[PDB]
Structure formats: structure tokens, C-alpha cells
Assembly symmetry: D3
Homo-oligomer: 228 residues x 6
Amino acid sequence: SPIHVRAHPGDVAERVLLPGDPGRAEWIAKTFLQNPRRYNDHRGLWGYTGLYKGVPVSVQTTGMGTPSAAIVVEELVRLGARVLVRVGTAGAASSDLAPGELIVAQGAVPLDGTTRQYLEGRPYAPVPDPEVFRALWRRAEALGYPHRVGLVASEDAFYATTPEEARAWARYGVLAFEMEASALFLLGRMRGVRTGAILAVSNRIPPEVLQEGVRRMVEVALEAVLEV
Amino acid sequence: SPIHVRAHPGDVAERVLLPGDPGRAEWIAKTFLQNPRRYNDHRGLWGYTGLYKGVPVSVQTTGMGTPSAAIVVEELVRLGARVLVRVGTAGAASSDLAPGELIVAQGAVPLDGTTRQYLEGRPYAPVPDPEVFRALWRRAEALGYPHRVGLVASEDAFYATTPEEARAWARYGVLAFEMEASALFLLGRMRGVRTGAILAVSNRIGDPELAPPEVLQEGVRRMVEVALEAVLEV
Amino acid sequence: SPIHVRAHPGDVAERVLLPGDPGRAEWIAKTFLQNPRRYNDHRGLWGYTGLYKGVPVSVQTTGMGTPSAAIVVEELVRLGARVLVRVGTAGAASSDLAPGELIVAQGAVPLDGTTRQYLEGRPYAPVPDPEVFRALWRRAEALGYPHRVGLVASEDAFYATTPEEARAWARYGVLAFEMEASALFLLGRMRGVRTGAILAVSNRIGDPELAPPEVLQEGVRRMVEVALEAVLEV
Amino acid sequence: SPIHVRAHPGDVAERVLLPGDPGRAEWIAKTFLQNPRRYNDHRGLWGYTGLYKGVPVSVQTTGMGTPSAAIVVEELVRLGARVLVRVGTAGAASSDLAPGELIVAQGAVPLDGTTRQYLEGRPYAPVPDPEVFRALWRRAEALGYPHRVGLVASEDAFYATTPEEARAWARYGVLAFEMEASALFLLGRMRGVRTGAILAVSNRIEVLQEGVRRMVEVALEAVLEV
Amino acid sequence: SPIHVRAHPGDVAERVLLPGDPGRAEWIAKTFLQNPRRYNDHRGLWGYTGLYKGVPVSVQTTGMGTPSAAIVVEELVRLGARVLVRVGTAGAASSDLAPGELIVAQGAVPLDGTTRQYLEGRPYAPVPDPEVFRALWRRAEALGYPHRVGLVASEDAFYATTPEEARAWARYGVLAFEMEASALFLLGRMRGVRTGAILAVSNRIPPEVLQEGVRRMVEVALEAVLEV
Amino acid sequence: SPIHVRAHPGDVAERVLLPGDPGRAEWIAKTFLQNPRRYNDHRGLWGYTGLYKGVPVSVQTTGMGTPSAAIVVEELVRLGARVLVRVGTAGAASSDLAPGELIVAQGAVPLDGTTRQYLEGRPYAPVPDPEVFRALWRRAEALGYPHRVGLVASEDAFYATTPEEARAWARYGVLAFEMEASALFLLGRMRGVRTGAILAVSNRIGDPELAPPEVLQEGVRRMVEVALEAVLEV
């Protein structure tokens, strides 16, 4: 059994959603999955496996930051995960992005040290698996949910980035900041698995507004993993 | 008029293909466009504008390397270019890529100093415009041409990269190596234009020569056709 | 109220223990504290406050990695935390360290991107508050549990470090690897609060599994007792 | 035959001038060389060979940027080139440089990614071959053309450098900016050939044409000396 | 015989003080040691050995900067040095430090190229040997000499650092700047020897005020090396 | 008065030789200068001023390493130094260089942290003043002393460089390693003064000891003669 996600291969489905908040993992499992079973609660990394339209799907908590996410992804891959889609929130890098809007991550600027360590400081362009990316985009359109498609930036120091710095990055295509995508994308290529990310804007660097965005994001992710 | 591409607005169309070789730019203009007109020859950066299925389309030589490509892209944008698609050859990093095969660039690892200077050494993920990327992929599928979709790596030193380094990069998703995409993708975001890149594999890293001129030529034709059909969609 | 640790200033004590595992935080609170109350469970970041030998003490989950720990530390300071001692596990880099042994962190090699971001890539020597460090060392000596005093390395990629690399770092003084110390130490100086870290060796770099639960749990108990005794000394 | 400069060893002389612009390569050939002949036009990298005062001299287009120049220099070396002198224009970083003024490059600050890739990010001091440098300086003095001897900076992003940054570099000895010297100098040492660079200030970050003419005359006289 | 410190086995004691100034090395030897002897003067790196309270103790000039200090340390270690304590001055980065005040270095921010070369550019946290560090702190206390315990920054370009930059570093815990500690600490760990550093504030980025500081500093270092 | 070189404007001439070893500075002052006077001995940074062929020349000890040399150069400039030429020894990186052979430094690879700090990590090409460089070269040729003209590398960690790394650098043009030139050259441009460097090979990297004092001493003599002649010509 893996060190942090203490489960066995048979407990995890090939298709996995990756929320950062365990509270959100629980909500997703109970709201969208049939017969959800929590296969792991060790370290608070709540992980569930259930069925969505007859297809097994797991929802695994990653925690915050690429170091935590990388540990979870590495172990999930060992457990048989083949398609992994991060679902979470992100702070808008510019004033034009309103809370609740969806972002299909086309790539992730690696401002984190986890990718840096794996890469030994070499340049890189973290991108999702092309088919998963395409599926997320298509499903968002099919469901008629407004969304943006583009870059996000994965950072390490939540409280270091100033609003001015965020807007500076926006001039380079960065739509929002989060703390997990870059590592997920890198590991997707390193470990030969398919990955993707879709986010809901929670603030610009409204209870029902954000929640509806999260619900849409999850629905899109679930529909997309069934497409691959 | 710009310093290098000495054209005047009106000469350049909103949609532009970006081959690296001027001889290829000429061939593209005469082979696919109706009423091809050369608007620039300064510094050998041959540029043409003609009609493709009734739509204005320019073909502009970028030269080799991101510094050259960046100068050309910057000036084209200043002239009103809106959609720019690089078309060229690339060296396969894996043994899974057969010569003549097409690669729709999903992103470009920035191993070049041009993006580095523009970014002041900061990390970045050079990616094409999502719509252009999608169009290139869809067109390749519609025309039934075999293709791979994924990362390429943009380098500065053509003769520095070894087969060992190439295979190492392939383990991180790099399909092939070329020398212009990263800067094109970065400028696309910086200057607000829609960019993309589609390449034809001309060889494997470490090869003294390029694949058969025939197998490559058919790849170049397909690549160009896909690019043309794509820019019309955006 | 803070974004992640959703508590109110009155909920958190000046003295706080920082385990990485929420299950460990719960065990510490229930095992060592009188009148323990959980003031936060949002994001699974379980935080408790109780009394230890008549002195208020909080136990706050940090999660794994400096990005998570930094968020928790920044918010804890806003909530009134003044003395923060990390208590966690570490993978021995040397063969000299055995599972269950304690390590009082004299400093932390910053192999993480969180300190790097705060420092804008500049060099630094993450070190605990001197008084806290002194108290942890003194208490470890007094209790008599096997321990070492020295450097640890705070890394981001748990699964990237090979046994070969670990041994190389040991030649430079690194006793073990963990994933939070560097950021805590940096923030201690930046925010003007007193920090420290004591760890229990849970394995050797390269091991597929952690040491026997019995061994590991005893090491954890010893480490917490030392930390609790130490925070009362400052 | 090399991949980009599709020439034969017999086509390239031991002494080569390296202009960046093909139109300038042509002008140099037809203006200074006897019986000039073009041995390559592939990829627009026009290369010519002719006689200068009875000595064979080639004029090869490098294109813009160190990546393009490195490809050209690597191939020229494989073709037998022994002495390579870059001739081109530069953007003055300092105010004391007037348009048309000549600069004999003593060294080149490597702000480019090509030298960075060859060096794997390690520090370096790109310098020309001692003898070629000495000859360029001496010839510029003989012909009596106003010149300066010092550092230039080779960059990748033509449109990224601001006047403020240029002025900052000038405080460290940078006289002007260009985009090829660093890689040429590095390859000179790496490949065992003699390189040098002389430039004509075309701007501040027939005036320029005369500078170009003087620049070329100096280079031709200098390569004959080595 | 070593290349720079041209001494031989038998000239250097296991316990060594490392002043940067040769004039100070001389003063220390004549002032605190019995039957002092200068075993080296080559390159001005004056080195002496004598007895302090019956214990052999060497006083070796390091010169200025980590490159010079690394050379001296490497050679001293080869000659038998096992406990090395740097004694010297530093420029206060903060406004709370008064000239002559003592600083027991808990660690040294590596802003130098010597440590960088040895480490091949990798991150590091230069710290003294814990026992020596502890001894210096304890002796300063026992002797009742006012002292501060914390970080110093080891730099290469004495004249490049501005008061503004110094103040910035102070906000990160840097008490003062000097030019030798980082390399001493790194080599201590690399060569398996015990090192430490105690400094007297000489300025901020009075003769007897500083001299008394220097005297207290040396006395503390001497007592500390006998303690380990 | 400067902090380290405790002298005053009057003690130092416009022309200065910069040996690293104070014992060599003394030997030079007494062997080539007339009416030599030592104006500083603080920190063992022995500095003398006398007349060479009726011209005032100073000989100032720099110490070892760019940090020490940088301090000395900065203060010398404040004291009125206008032409400064380093004279010292170097470890051959190549196998073709023989102990005692001279090297006129055309440039210095900056592998040191001093220039890095001054430059804030930016790339640079440390070079001497062109006229001083020319003077040294011409003088060496005139006197007919065997010499080489080219790059040296200025390093910080004398004991870190291996023969293997030295040989690798030789393939990129590095003739020998030393520890001061890069900073001297950089400050020359920064402070607007004329600098240069001429060295005598004292050993080949990897050698436990230097070459015979005889062979080496003669090299040192020629080097100083060349340097002294040169400074009087600019």
C-alpha cells in the first residue's frame, strides 16, 4: 500500500477527479456518484470511488500545493489511475474574470518548486493530455456553460503574490493562479497517464455564485473523463 | 515601414503562414495562392500575399531561430497580422515519429534565449492560441492526414543537442525539436494575436541528413494544406 | 477570518505545535491536552487548543509541503501564534540515523519553491528561532531519547529524491529530508515570531514503506513530549 | 554538403566575411571582389567567393540571431573556413557613439541563448581570436577611419531592450548591441578557428553606407594579414 | 606542505581561532597565549600557536573573502585543525545593533561564490557545528557579555551592497554582513570538522568601544574551543 | 582614508601593479623601484610606491580571491589609481602550457561570486582595457619572452576544481585558472580606469606543489618587467 494514500489498486478507478479540498471531495462523491465508498481517510486525504452513469470514477483529495498533489498523483498512478482531472478554484489574474467562471487549463506556467525539482531546474511547458483537454473543452460547450480556455499559473507561495504581480502575468496570457496543475501535467507526461484541469474562479486576486461554478466544473469534468 | 519586413500596412493579410525558408515561402505562395504578390524581399525575408479560397492569406519567411522569428512576428503584428501559423520541419526526439509525419504543436518547451530575454528568465509555458490549435487538429483529422498532437522543444543551438539528450526530453513528452515555436507562442499572448504551429518530421535527432525529399515533400504539402484550412476558420 | 484556517484570534494560543498529519494533530490534542476543543476542520486542516500543564497550547495541522505549511503559518500568525514548533516525520539521508530517532533541526536546506518565491530566488539559510532551538535541544537531552542535532533538507518532490542523491546531501551535513521546515523558519524571521522543528525518523530514503507502526508511534510520542516541554520554556 | 549552407569545400575560401544581410553580402562581393561567384542561395543564405588582391575570400550570409549564425559558422568550419570576421551593424548603447562610427569588438557580452546552450548555462567571456582582433584594430588605424575598441553585447530579443537597459549596460563597458558576435567568438575557440567582429553603428537604442564600406574594407585588409 | 599556509604537521593545534586580519592574529597570540610561536607568514597569512590555560590553540589569519578563507581552512584541516572558530568584525544590517556588540552566528546566508562553486549552485543552509555554536552562546552568557544570536550574511562584493539592500536583508533575519562564515560552515560539514563564528559589530552599513568588543569576542571564542 | 588599504591620495601613483602575494609586492618594490616607500601594511595588504625609470609606480598587494582584490581595487581607484595591471601566478588548464610561461589575459571567464554580485547574476565578458592589453602584448613580444595570449578563468574555490574540469574548460579557450582578473576587469569598466593582467604559470591543475622556485621565479621576473614597461606606456 502507498505511504500516504493507503489503499490498494482495486480500490481506485482508472478515471479520477482531483479536488484540493477534502470537503469538496466528499461533496462531489455524495452529490454526483452512485454508491460512493471512501477508500482512504489517512492524513485527511479523503478519497472516494463510486459510479457515474455506470462508469467507475474516483475522487481523490490532493491537499494544497504541488508537493502534496505530486505525492497523491504519484501514488494514484501506482494504484492504477489512468485519467486524472484536477477540479478546483483559482484566483483571477485580472479584473475581467468574474467569480464562478470556468477555466479549461490549456497549460500551466510552472512557478512551483515541485516541477523544478523533477526537472532539475530545466525549462518546460506543463500541458494536459491533448484528448482530455479537448474533452473538457467540448463538454463545456455541449453543456452550454460559459468558460475560458487558456493558461493558469501554478505557484507555491499563496501569500507572496501581489495583485500587481498577478496582473503582470496576465499580460503574458495567465488567466488565473492556482497551486497544483503544473505538477499534475508534468507527471502526466512522465508517468504516461492522461491529465487535465478545469477550475472555477473563486475570487479576483457570493455563496451560490461560486457553488454553481463548482457544480458546473465538476459536471464538465465527469462528462469529460467518460469521453476518454 | 518596419525595419526588416519592409512592407506597408495593406500588404499583409490578417492570416499569415510562417515558413522558415524563403524558398518554401515562394513555393507555398505559387502552389496554393491565387494572384501571389511579393511585398517584401529585404534581407531575404520573402513575404507574399494572395488569395486562398477567396480569403487573403500571407506567407512570410521567418529565417532560422527565435531571434529571427521574433523580429518577423513583432513586425507582422505591427503591420496588422492577426492569425499566424508556423509551418516547418522538426527533428524527432522519439523513434515513434516517422519522417513526413505531422505534429500539431500543443506547446513548446522554451530552451531558447529569446523567450528568456522577453520573460527576464522567468518560467513560462509557451502555448498556441487555443482556437488555432483546435482548428489545426480538426483540419488534420478532416483531411485524413496522420498526425501527432503534443509538445515540441524550441532550441537555439541546432548542433549542440545530442541523441541522448533528445531521448531524455522525449521521456518528458517532447515529440520533436525545432527552433521557432516558443517565441511565436509567447508573442502571441504578449501581442494579443492567434498563433499556432504544425510541423513535418524531417529526420531523427543525430541524422547527418534529412529524410527522403519525396516523403518529406508530401509531408510539407499536407502540413501547408492543414494550416491554410485552419487559418480560414479563425 | 482567515481563508484556510477558519478560526478567530481568540481560538489560537500563543504556543502552537505544527504536525503535518491531521490524525496526528487529533491524537496529540486528546492525549496531551486538557479541555481540547477543535477550532477548525475546514480543508481537513484540523486545529485544536487546550491546556498543557496550565498553559494554553494549540495543535494545528499543516498538510504536506511548504506551500501548505506556509499558508497555515501565515494565517496562524494573524491569529496570534507567537511560538510555533513543527513536529513531524523525516526520511533519514544517512545510514547512521535509525527509525524512531529524533532530530532537532538546527537549520533547513531550502530545496523548496515556497521559500524561493518569498526570497525571489535569493540565497538564504533557514534557521529556527535561537531560543526555541535551544529549548528543544535542552528538553531532548533531559528526557534522554536518542536524538541528533543538525541539518534537514526541505524538499518539494518526495518521489524525486533517490538514495544516491540522499547520500550525496548527507556528505554536506543533511541528516534527513522532510517538507516543511525551510518555510516555517523563513516565515519566523519575516513575521517576527519564534519557530522550531523536531522530527522523528520514519524511514530511510528509498524505503517503499515506513518503519513498524510501533516504532514510529513511539518516536512520535517522544517528539511531541519534547516539543510541549520546550514551548513552555519560551 | 551541409544541411543549410549547401556548399562544397572547394566553394569556401579560408578567409570569410560574415554579413548578416544577404543583400549586403551581394554588395560586398560585387563591390570588393574580383570574379565573385555565388556558391549558395539555399534558405536565402547567399554566399560568395572571389579574389581580394589576389587572395580568395568568401562572403557568407549569417541571417539574424546567434541561432542562425551558429548554424552558418558550424557549417562553414566543416567546409574549411579558417578565418571568419563578422561585419554588420550595431545599436549604440552609449551617447558618445555617432552613426557610421566603427567598433572593433574586443569581446561580446553573451545575452543570447545559443552560447548558453553550448555552455550549459556556465559563465564565459566571448572574445575574438587575438591575432584577428589585433589586425582589425591595426587596419582601422591605418585606413584612418574613426573607430572605438571595446565590448558589444549579443542579444536575442531585438525588440525587448529599452533605452534605460541600454544605458545601464553602457555603465559596464557595453558600447553597442548586436545579435551574433558572442556565438561566433565561442565557436571560434571551440572549433579552433580565428574569428573577429567589426561593426558600424546604424542607430541609437549615406551616413551608414559609408560606415559599411569602411567596415568592409577594414575586414578584408585584416583577414589577409592572418 | 600546503601551498598557501606553509606549515607542517605539529605546527597547528586541534583548536584554532580564525581572525581575518593578520594584525589581529598577532595581537591575539601575544595577548592571550603563553609561549606563542608564528609557524607561518607566507602570503601574509600569519599563523600562531601557543597555550591558553594549558591547552594548545592556534590563531590563523584567513585573509578577506570566502575564497581566501576556504583556502586557509582546507589547508588547516589537512594540518590537523578540528575545531575552528572565526572571530572578526561585521557591518550591522539593522539599527538595533550597536558597534562593539557581539554576534554569535547561528547561520550564514551564502551570498558568496565559493560556497556556490563547492555546491555547484545548489541551495544550502550554512550553519556552525551545533556543539561549538552552543559553547559560544553559553560562554558569552557565563562571562556576562552583551550578545545577539542569529544570522549573518557572507558576501563577496563589499562595496556593492547598499544600506537599502542591507535593510531589506534585515527584514529576513540578517543581523550583519561579513565575508567568511558561509564557507567556513560549509567546509566544516564537508570535511567533518567543528566550526563556529563570533563577531564584533564594527559599523552599520569608536576605537576602544570596538576593541573591547574584540577582546570580549576573543575571550569567548577561546573559552568555547576549550569547552569542546 | 580607505577602510582596508589605509593610505591617502598622494601615497599611490596613477600606475599600479597588483601582485597577489605581499612578499612578492615587497620583492618587486625593492628589485625594480628606486626610493621605494611602503604606504600601507594594514591587513598585510603591503603597498609600496617608488620610481621606475624616473616614473612613479605603486605596487599593491590584493590578497587572494576576487572579494579581496575587489576591495583593494575599489580603494585604489579612490586613491587616484588610473592604470592597474595584475601580476600573478596561474594554474595551467591545458597540457601545452609549461610552468614559467607567460599569459597576457585577453579576457577572464567569470566563475567568481564577486563579479556575479556586482552584476546581479547577469552575463558578462570581463576584458582588460584595450590599450593596456595591447601594451602588455607588444612588450612581451619585444622582450622576446615566450608567452600566450588568451582567456584565463577566475574562480572562487581553489580546491574545488578538478583536472578533468580544467581540461573541459581548456576546450573552450581557457588557458589557465587564477582568482582575481574577472573582478579587476569588471571594475575597470565600472570605475572608468585602465586595467590589464599578465600571469606566470606556476603549476598544472591537479599538482600537489608548484614548479621549481627557479623556473617560477624567472617567470615572475619577466612578467613584472613586461608589466612595469607597459604601465609607463599608457
